[model samples]
Target: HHHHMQARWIGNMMFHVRTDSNHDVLMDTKEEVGGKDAAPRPLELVLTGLMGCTGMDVVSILRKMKVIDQMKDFRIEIEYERTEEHPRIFTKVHLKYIFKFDGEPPKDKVEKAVQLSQEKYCSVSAILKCSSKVTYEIVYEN
Candidate 1:
């Protein structure tokens, strides 16, 4: 299905973005760069999207495997670096998937789920991989 969205410039490096899912987002930058910094920057939104995409995929896969209940406090942390030049783009991106388990950590299944997302499921991950080096690590706590 084709998705349609709109973004309207509200003046001074700020935009009112409307998503295909009917959500509204305020996109802005810092005051020093012309925006009032009232909302998240566009690049920040990109990172957020990446996190949500993979996070959801991994959780869904694990749930389907009936192992989600064994895991708790599941979270994903993403760190990124960018080029210094104009039209700055991501150079390296790293994701840390942290999990707390009631018993033994499902390390193999977790790794498989994450790998599946990175290699096949998550479109955002694929798109980012076109321009950046995307890598991930998994950590578990008992």
Candidate 2:
């Protein structure tokens, strides 16, 4: 399995990025840092990818368990603690998996799916865990 991305410099600390999947996105820095603040920062995309990767895993697992239909809506809220110095690497990452259900949620199954996503699936989570303390919580709503 191979993945590739290229960033074409577009001046002022911004770039036009293209992935091997043939998708294009813009990467930029804050205006204070000489960027136009036109799009998401590269580091922000890392967290975004984490959310996407784990969200997909949980959904896929829930579908396999036949619990997807019970969900009315789902979202993940992620927060992280970053170092104040150079590099600004994340030290802690917390994820809240919020769900709205049409009926009583299969809490155990949902938790199990989330656990499996963090522990067994979600490549982005796996990579981030190497340098960050990753944790999660589940929230349910009617």
Candidate 3:
């Protein structure tokens, strides 16, 4: 629960997070938040966290299954719908996974990997699912 951000003001202000171990993030406030430009808002951070969490899980699982040896590329696309209400909560989350392999990977194994991440491995997805419906699709490149 420990975190820190540094802020600097010019015509616009920028905020940065100290991510420990030689890393930092810079963010500029949006016009709505009293700055001249838009930066990652809070909700976007939530989605980013979810993406990072699931991305790691999927890659780790695939590696452990030895499927990475057969793959040439992998990508994940996360999309969500936001509510029109005042709070502007996310209503739905869609995950699209694109993968390329030298040979066809077992469909069942791929499904199992995704199932494990969604059902037991990803903490971010678990928390988000409490407030939103999450769905996913996996596609393989020939």
Candidate 4:
């Protein structure tokens, strides 16, 4: 598949971006970094997108595996550890998955679900793994 995005400079260190589906997003630097703020910066957007990709994959995989039904809540949280040098890049990417079920939550199934997303399905995770260490843990609650 092929895709492209175009960005327009709105003001000082801020831009308006349009992507694949023609959705508009504002990318801006922090107040301390530049002028003002509108939306998330490019790196922040990427981080959020990564979480969404993995989250969707896990949900779909679990449903397909027939291991999820009585779902109460599901949440995915991502934490980034950055290098302390000039080119400050992410050194570690940690993901925490929380699942709440009405009855007993199958921890094993959820683990496998997350594993499938990280190892096989999530393209975002696969790509990010090249630049940073990607790790995850699951919490199952009834």
Best by TM-score: 2
Candidate 1 — which residues are off by over 4 angstroms? Answer: 122-125, 129-132
Ranking by lDDT: 2, 1, 4, 3
**CA lDDT of every candidate:** 0.84, 0.85, 0.73, 0.80
* 1-142 per-residue lDDT for model 3 (tens digits): 3475454443556565666555765556578768656567645676777877877887888889877788788788887777788776777778987788887676677777788887787545667843555888998888
Q: Note each model's CA RMSD in angstroms.
A: 2.1, 1.9, 3.2, 2.4
| Angstrom error at residue 94, model 4 | 1.3
Superposition-based RMSD of candidate 1 using all C-alpha atoms, in angstroms: 2.1
Greater-lDDT candidate between 3 and 4? 4
Instruction: Give per-residue CA lDDT, model 1, range 3-73, as digits (tens).
Output: 76778998999999777787899999999989998999887898888898999999999999889998878
What is the C-alpha lDDT profile of model 4 across 1-142, one tens digit per residue? 2766678997898888777886888888779988587788788888888888988888887788786687789998887788779787777878889889877887777888888888877646666743555878887766
Question: Candidate 3: lDDT over CA atoms?
Answer: 0.73
lDDT of 3 at 116: 85
Query: Which residue pairs overlap in candidate 1's backbone?
Result: none
Q: Order of candidates by TM-score, top first? A: 2, 1, 4, 3
Candidate 2, lDDT over the whole model:
0.85
Cα distance off (Å), candidate 2, residue 53: 0.8
Runs with alpha carbons beyond 4 Å of true place in candidate 4: 66-68, 122-124, 129-132
**Lowest summed lDDT window (length 10), candidate 2:** 122-131
Worst 10 residues of 1 by lDDT: 122-131
